[PDB]
């Protein structure tokens, strides 16, 4: 068994030599070519490192590794790392069995990236759902950098818990996160009040909305 | 059998043209701890010219 | 088992060259541990090393001995030999052959060792082995008298080798005439008249002299 | 092709002659082609049959 | 050169701890590996000590030492000595140039051995031996622990004329001495006289054979 070992998370800032580390279970390492993928969220894995010291055409020179051979483990190194390096890396190598295993994944993380506000947006329902017979409030959260985001609800003058469903935060394309909330509701509740605020909780700072049905 | 040969970081070269290479010194002498030969064979190479 | 066995001429001349030859089993000397040594002792002094040899060529003398030891060796027979030209009187010693470890970081630990032989340089009477009888309770007792003899490296054996139980050796002393002595004894119980006769056997390494006598 | 290396099949090295046409060779004398016998056994330039 | 140098003999009761330290005359003794070995009486050296902190399989933990550069002494440490530890012991080194040196060599005896009284042994010349023309009587001198032992021999009335060998004592594998002695005379001799002894002298006892040839 040839089972390869990744830390959770690394951090590092920008513009220099950030090492990302894999350790092997047992085996050999010598045995069997170790390889590294790069996965994105919402995305298929994409081969950077083969043979152990060799890189395809259109990747960066960045990216780099060596293997230890005192350890029996595997590094992967970028020279001059950036903004858009950031993403999950995976040690894959082969067992003596013809066993292919892949590593547990390490989650890159961007240190040197500034703080953010989130871009709180709020729809209300419209027609063709008012026909349906139904509501449903869309609060969007989005570019916000931490990951701490909370959601909150208020009515026309006190707080109100109805079914309320959040999104879990994700990574976008840029590097950013994203959220979504929802409240359903009643027509007929809904047209008994005069307003509906969401409220979201940042690190510093908070944004309501208060959209009011009518007029 | 020379002196003094020089160091890997300037590593001499020397260059072999216009003479009988007669590979057979090296079989007379033989204090070799290792010898391999790529591509070419070791009971060939009399047999062969470069 | 590695073992290593002492071999060559017993008897050397004064002023001449020395020879010895020591044969190795259960090893490559080419890839075992490289290098090869030999070591001599004197009667009651300590080891002096004397020289190794690599399979290559390469090799180390004794600077207080560099003029006289000359050291070669077998690839093939797995034998390595030493010579030394210019013999004295003082010479005689006690010769082994050892190995050294190479394949670590250093040269170090002398592990294995010979057998051991005790060369002679000395000419002067020059004679060959005697053997003589000695004269024999609930025990009994006898033994064997070996006389005559020049060459020190002399080996004895009680019934072949077979059933050795109570067999007992002397140290050996040099006559006034040139002539060592040596003595060995066993002692064996009354009723053992039966079976395993009470034969001592001598053999004469220098000379390959062999004698079985009751 | 076990995984500890399956070394049940083997090819003859070098011969001194080329096989014929179905010819079967099993001989498992140590081949030499240097400039010195190997006495059956594998010297410093001497090569297994198989 | 890289001269070793070592003390003859030491000597100390059982049960105790022993100090034995090989100094180099010449060169640092550190820049080398430095070995000891034991040789029994009657056997060959064996290994004991090397890389001057290490010890084999098979000897006792009873052996351990280490080196010291700045006195250019080689410590060596016996805890729990016994009778079986009774051997020679030998320092070595390598010089600089390559040149392996041995020590002087160290006898080690143990002191606290009980006493022992020496057994005697005679032979007389048997006729295969007359029948040639000669004759010479065997003494056996053994099982006794103190060197002081001398010999003695007497025919009836007086010493015999005839010359008389003796042995040079020597320690045996079992922790005791060996010796003998030899006297060569004419059958004539041997016949023309009444007996003949092999006399051992100890402290404060001796013992005879009194080996009568007629009768």
């Known amino acids: 068994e040839f089972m390869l070992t990744q830390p959770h998370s690394v951090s590092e800032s920008p513009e220099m030599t950030v090492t990302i580390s894999c350790?092997?279970?047992?085996?050999?390492?010598?045995?069997?070519?170790?390889?590294?993928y790069q996965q994105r969220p919402g995305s298929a894995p994409t081969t950077?490192?083969?043979?152990?010291?060799?890189?395809?055409?259109?990747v960066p020179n960045r990216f780099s590794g060596s293997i230890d051979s005192s350890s029996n483990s595997a590094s992967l190194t970028i020279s001059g790392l950036k903004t858009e390096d950031e993403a999950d890396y995976y040690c894959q190598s082969y067992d003596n069995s013809n066993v292919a295993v892949f590593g547990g994944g390490t989650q890159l993380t961007v240190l040197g990236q500034p703080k953010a506000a989130p871009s709180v947006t709020l729809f209300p329902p419209s027609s063709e759902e008012l026909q349906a017979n139904k509501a449903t409030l869309v609060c969007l959260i989005s570019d916000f950098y931490p990951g701490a985001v909370t959601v909150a609800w208020k009515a026309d003058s006190s707080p109100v818990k109805a079914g309320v469903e959040t999104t879990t935060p994700s990574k976008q394309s840029n590097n950013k996160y994203a959220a979504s909330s929802y409240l359903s509701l009643t027509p007929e509740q809904w047209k008994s009040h005069r307003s509906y605020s969401c409220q979201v909780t940042h690190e510093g700072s908070t944004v309501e909305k208060t959209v009011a049905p009518t007029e | 059998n020379a002196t003094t040969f020089a160091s890997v970081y300037a590593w001499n070269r020397k260059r072999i043209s216009n003479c009988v290479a007669d590979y057979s010194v090296i079989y007379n002498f033989a204090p070799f701890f290792a010898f391999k030969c790529y591509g070419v064979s070791p009971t060939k190479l009399n047999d062969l010219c470069f | 088992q590695v073992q290593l066995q002492e071999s060559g001429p017993g008897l050397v001349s004064p002023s001449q060259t020395l020879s010895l030859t020591c044969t190795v089993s259960?090893?490559?000397?080419?890839?075992?541990?490289?290098?090869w040594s030999w070591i001599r002792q004197p009667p009651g002094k300590g080891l002096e090393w004397i020289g190794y040899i690599h399979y290559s060529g390469n090799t180390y003398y004794n600077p207080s001995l560099k003029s006289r030891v000359a050291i070669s060796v077998d690839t093939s027979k797995n034998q390595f030999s030493l010579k030394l030209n210019s013999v004295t009187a003082a010479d005689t010693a006690v010769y082994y052959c050892?190995?050294?470890?190479?394949?670590?970081?250093?040269?170090?630990?002398?592990?294995?060792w010979g057998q051991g032989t005790l060369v002679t340089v000395a000419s002067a009477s020059t004679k060959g082995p005697s053997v003589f009888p000695l004269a024999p309770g609930g025990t009994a007792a006898l033994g064997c008298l070996v006389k005559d003899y020049f060459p020190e490296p002399v080996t004895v054996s009680w019934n072949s080798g077979a059933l050795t139980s109570g067999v007992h050796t002397f140290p050996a002393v040099l006559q006034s005439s040139g002539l060592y002595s040596l003595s060995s004894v066993v002692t064996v119980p009354s009723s053992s008249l039966g079976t395993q006769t009470y034969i001592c056997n001598v053999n004469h390494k220098p000379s390959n002299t062999k004698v079985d006598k009751r | 092709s076990k995984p500890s290396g399956n070394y049940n099949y083997l090819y003859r090295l070098l011969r001194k002659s080329k096989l014929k046409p179905f010819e079967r060779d099993i001989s498992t004398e140590i081949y030499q082609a240097g400039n010195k016998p190997c006495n059956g056994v594998a010297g410093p330039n001497c090569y297994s049959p198989l | 050169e890289f001269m070793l140098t070592q003390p003859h003999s030491v000597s100390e009761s059982p049960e105790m701890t022993v100090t034995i330290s090989c100094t180099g005359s010449?060169?640092?003794?550190?820049?080398?590996?430095v070995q000891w070995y034991q040789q029994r009486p009657g056997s060959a050296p064996t290994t004991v000590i090397y890389?001057?902190?290490?010890?084999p399989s098979g000897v006792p933990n009873r052996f351990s030492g280490s080196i010291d550069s700045s006195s250019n002494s080689a410590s060596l440490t016996i805890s729990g000595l016994k009778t079986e530890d009774e051997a020679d012991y030998y320092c070595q080194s390598y010089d600089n140039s390559n040149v392996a040196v041995f020590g002087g060599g160290t006898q080690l005896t143990v002191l606290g051995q009980p006493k022992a009284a020496p057994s005697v042994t005679l032979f007389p010349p048997s006729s295969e031996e007359l029948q040639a023309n000669k004759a010479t009587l065997v003494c056996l001198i053994s099982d006794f622990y103190p060197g002081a032992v001398t010999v003695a021999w007497k025919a009836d009335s007086s010493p015999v004329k005839a010359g008389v060998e003796t042995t040079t004592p020597s320690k045996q594998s079992n922790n005791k001495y060996a010796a003998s002695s030899y006297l060569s005379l004419t059958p004539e001799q041997w016949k023309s006289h009444r007996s003949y002894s092999c006399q051992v002298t100890h402290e404060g006892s001796t013992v005879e054979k009194t080996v009568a040839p007629t009768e």
């Open positions: 050892a190995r050294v470890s190479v394949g670590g970081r250093l040269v170090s630990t002398f592990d294995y």
């Open positions: 890389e001057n902190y290490q010890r």
């Open positions: 010449s060169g640092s003794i550190a820049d080398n590996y």
């Open positions: 259960g090893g490559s000397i080419r890839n075992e541990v490289y290098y």
